Amino acid sequence: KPFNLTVAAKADLRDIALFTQRRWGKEQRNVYLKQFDDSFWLLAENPDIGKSCDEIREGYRKFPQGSHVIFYQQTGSQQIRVIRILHKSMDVNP
Amino acid sequence: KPFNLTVAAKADLRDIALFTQRRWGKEQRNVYLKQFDDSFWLLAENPDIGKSCDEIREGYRKFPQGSHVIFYQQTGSQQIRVIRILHKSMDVNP
Amino acid sequence: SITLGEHFDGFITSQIQSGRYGSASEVIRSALRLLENQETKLQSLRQLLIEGEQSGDADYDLDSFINELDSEN
Amino acid sequence: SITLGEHFDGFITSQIQSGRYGSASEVIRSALRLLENQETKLQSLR
Amino acid sequence: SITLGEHFDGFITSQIQSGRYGSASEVIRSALRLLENQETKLQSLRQLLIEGEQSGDADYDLDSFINELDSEN
Amino acid sequence: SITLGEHFDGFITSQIQSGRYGSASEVIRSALRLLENQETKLQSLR
Amino acid sequence: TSITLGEHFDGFITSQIQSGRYGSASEVIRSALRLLENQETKLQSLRQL
Amino acid sequence: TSITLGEHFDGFITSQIQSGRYGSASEVIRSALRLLENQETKLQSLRQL
């Protein structure tokens, strides 16, 4: 409710889950998905925790999570929208 | 108490913490260290969750955690010893 | 021509002396290749964000997602 | 020294026409800075 | 000599035809380089585990570790 | 075809002397399998 | 000093010098050898005894 | 077909063929160009319009 993902973000999460399941296992995949669900709730309950990245796109914020990086836009005081969950294909560009 | 790290494992954790702090921030580093503390407690409360890797060394088990991989040996029914927290420099070798 | 400074001029000379780069044009071209690759990477990340944001909001719940993934295999 | 290819001669002007860089000197020095940072990542692995 | 099978013999031929590898000795040497690099990587991981396990147990607590890291900077 | 270097001729024997591989055929085919897996990782990125 | 590269590799080098991102035919091989040296030098785990 | 490589690069190639892990001087350049082609082909994000 305080956070919602896009179809692309859900597809990315499914890709990562299937990858970690085919490599490690099913319980591993469950632990990994519980971790990002916790990260989702954390970004919702605290949207100023992700470093701002207006340079890349105006309004977006990014948060590191293992080998991937969640991109999300703040849509409320404690509401955020997760748009993409990519890998390390990202750039700082300060 | 149910888990304990070595000097090398603590040095690795300190390296990762300082890296994520210099790159992202202090609160990021705290969230990251809370995640691995949770992973430590999980590996202690459930030591059969890490895929066995006797091929590499007899008795060790490995668990994925973002861009690093915890290596730990089971020293009890619900007690484990974390020896190393390396990056992706690892090999399956099935 | 252009003016970079004592830092980069010194750098370019040390890179040429190392035998890894023949000409100063060569090392400047390698740097420009790096910058162009990073620009293409930036634009690719931007188009990924665009195609992600102009897609629909998806109905997400952790346990429902796990149940779906279990029903797949 | 300044005998670059037409591709790079066009790219420097295209990226200074953005408004984030001053002129060709700044784009060339930032590219050289990326190159030096990549070389320094190698120097930690001497 | 040696005997690998129709899978690898076919492979080697397709790798030679691609123009990326001149000789079959060359592609087999590239494969052997890969295997040797992985063996050295395995031994390096093993020595890392050895040097980690024969070191001392360290007194670890999450909040104490965070306090130490904060006291550093 | 079998004209390998002395380094590789020694390495194949050193790794079959471990007891994990049968003979030079198996080490060469496992190395070729690593190479084919690396090539297949490139084929997903055609 | 001369090498006998493959026809595919010669076509690749001609495409790299026609792409505008490389100046001479030797520049391409210098960049490739830079990559190869970065790879081989990184393999200094070999000295672990 | 001939290239004018640097003295450092010629020494590197001689060390690679004396290391026993490479057969001929052209083998080293072929491996390096393999790495370079894997790098450049991976940059197919350029076609994102």
* Structural domains counted in chain B: 1
Give the integer Cα–Cα distance in Å for F30 and F35: 9
Are G8 and E18 contacting, i.e. CB atoms less than 8 angstroms apart? yes
- Residue of D41, D42, D46 to mutate when probing chain G, most G C-beta within 10 A: D42
Asked if B71 is an interface residue toward chain E (Cβ–Cβ < 8 A), one would say yes
Give the residue from F31, H31, G46, H20 showing the smallest Cα distance to E32.
Answer: F31
* Complete DSSP assignment for A30-46: HHHHHHHHHHHHHHHH-
Give the integer Cα–Cα distance in Å for E59 and F6: 50
First-residue to last-residue Cα distance in chain D: 29
Strand B80-86 with B3-6, pairing:
parallel
Give the integer Cα–Cα distance in Å for A12 and A71: 12
Q: What share of chain G is helix, strand, coil (3-state, %, to 5)?
A: 60, 0, 40
**Which contiguous run of DSSP H or E holds residue E37?**
helix E24-53
Q: Quickly tell me which residue has 């000789």 as its tokens.
A: E23
Give the integer Cα–Cα distance in Å for D39 and C16: 13
Are B25 and A64 contacting, i.e. CB atoms less than 8 angstroms apart? no
Structure tokens at A23: 């490599």
* Structural domains counted in chain H: 1
Amino acid, res. A81: R
Chain D residue numbers with beta carbons less than 8 Å from the beta carbon of G44 are 45
Which positions ≥6 away from E42 have C-beta within 8 Å?
B56, B91, B93
Neighbors of chain E by Cβ distance (3+ pairs < 8 Å): B, F, G, H
- Asked whether the beta carbons of residue H23 and residue F42 sit closer than 8 angstroms, the reply is no
Asked if E36 is an interface residue toward chain H (Cβ–Cβ < 8 A), one would say yes
- Alpha-carbon dihedral sign for residues H31, H32, H35, H40: negative
- Asked whether the beta carbons of residue G40 and residue H16 sit closer than 8 angstroms, the reply is yes
Beta bridge partners of B82: B5, B72
Structure tokens at D25: 């000197």
Length of chain A: 94
**Which contiguous run of DSSP H or E holds residue E38?**
helix E24-53
Half-sphere exposure of residue A78: CA atoms within 13 angstroms, side-chain side: 6
**What value does the CA radius of gyration of chain F take, rounded to a whole number of Å?**
13
- Alpha-carbon dihedral sign for residues G18, G23, G25, G30: negative
Structure tokens at E2: 């040696």
How does E21-52 read in b/e, with b if 16+ C-beta sit within 10 Å?
A: bbbbbbbbbbbbbbbbbebbbbebbeebbeeb
Using alpha carbons only, what angle is made at residue E14 by residues E10 and E16, rounded to the nearest 5 degrees? 115
Whole-Å CA distances, G6 to C28, E23, H34: 29, 11, 12
A80: distance to nearest CA of chain B, Å? 18
Chain C residue numbers with beta carbons less than 8 Å from the beta carbon of A17 are 65, 69
Are B65 and B50 contacting, i.e. CB atoms less than 8 angstroms apart? no
Report helix angle G25-42 to C24-53, nearest 10. 70
Structure tokens at B55: 């091929």
Contacts by F32-40, CB closer than 8 A, 24 or more apart: F32/E4, F32/E8, F32/E11, F32/E12, F32/E27, F32/E28, F32/E31, F33/E8, F34/E31, F34/E34, F34/E35, F34/E38, F35/E27, F35/E30, F35/E31, F35/E34, F36/E8, F36/E11, F38/E34, F39/E15
CB neighbourhood size of H14 (10 A): 12
Structure tokens at C64: 């429902």
Whole-Å CA distances, A90 to A20, E32, F41: 21, 34, 21
Q: Quickly tell me which residue has 């590789």 as its tokens.
A: F8
Longest CA–CA span in chain D (Å) reads 39
Give the residue from B4, B7, B9 showing the smallest Cα distance to B84.
Answer: B9
Backbone φ and ψ for A3, nearest 5 degrees, come out as -145, 150
Are E30 and H32 contacting, i.e. CB atoms less than 8 angstroms apart? no
Contacts by B60-69, CB closer than 8 A, 24 or more apart: B60/E49, B62/B90, B63/A28, B63/B39, B64/A20, B64/A23, B64/A24, B64/A28, B64/A32, B65/A66, B65/B35, B65/B36, B65/B39, B66/A65, B66/A66, B66/A67, B66/B32, B66/B35, B67/A66, B67/A67, B67/A88, B68/B12, B68/B16
C16: distance to nearest CA of chain D, Å? 12
First-residue to last-residue Cα distance in chain B: 33
Chain B residue numbers with beta carbons less than 8 Å from the beta carbon of A63 are 28
How does B19-32 read in b/e, with b if 16+ C-beta sit within 10 Å?
A: ebbeebeeebbbbb
Are G30 and C22 contacting, i.e. CB atoms less than 8 angstroms apart? yes
Method: X-ray
Beta bridge partners of D40: none
Structure tokens at D3: 């005998």
Are C58 and C68 contacting, i.e. CB atoms less than 8 angstroms apart? no
Are B28 and A64 contacting, i.e. CB atoms less than 8 angstroms apart? yes
Chain G residue numbers with beta carbons less than 8 Å from the beta carbon of D2 are none
Which positions ≥6 away from C14 have C-beta within 8 Å?
none
Give the integer Cα–Cα distance in Å for A35 and A29: 10
Amino acid, res. B43: L
**What value does the CA radius of gyration of chain C take, rounded to a whole number of Å?**
24
Give the integer Cα–Cα distance in Å for C53 and A4: 12
Does residue G1 belong to any structural domain of this protein? no
Resolution of the determined structure in angstroms stands at: 3.0
Q: Looking at the partner chain, which of H20, H41, H42 has a beta carbon nearest the beta carbon of F5?
A: H20
Strand A80-86 with A3-6, pairing:
parallel
Give the integer Cα–Cα distance in Å for C48 and B54: 41
Give the integer Cα–Cα distance in Å for B1 and G13: 61
Q: Quickly tell me which residue has 């210099």 as its tokens.
A: B22
- Residue of C15, C18, C20, C33 to mutate when probing chain G, most G C-beta within 10 A: C20
Give the integer Cα–Cα distance in Å for C71 and C15: 57
Which positions ≥6 away from A21 have C-beta within 8 Å?
A28, A29, C69
Helix (H), strand (E), coil (C) string for chain F: CCCCCHHHHHHHHHHHCCCCCCCHHHHHHHHHHHHHHHHHHHHCCC
Are B89 and E45 contacting, i.e. CB atoms less than 8 angstroms apart? yes
Domain that holds residue A80: 1-94
Report helix angle B7-23 to E24-53, nearest 10. 110
Chain E residue numbers with beta carbons less than 8 Å from the beta carbon of F25 are 2-4
Backbone φ and ψ for G3, nearest 5 degrees, come out as -130, 155
Write the Ramachandran bin of F31: left for phi over 0, alpha for psi from -120 to 50, otherwise beta: alpha
Amino acid, res. G47: R
Domain that holds residue C51: 5-73
Longest CA–CA span in chain E (Å) reads 65
Grouping H, G, I as helix, E, B as strand and the rest as coil, residue B6 is strand
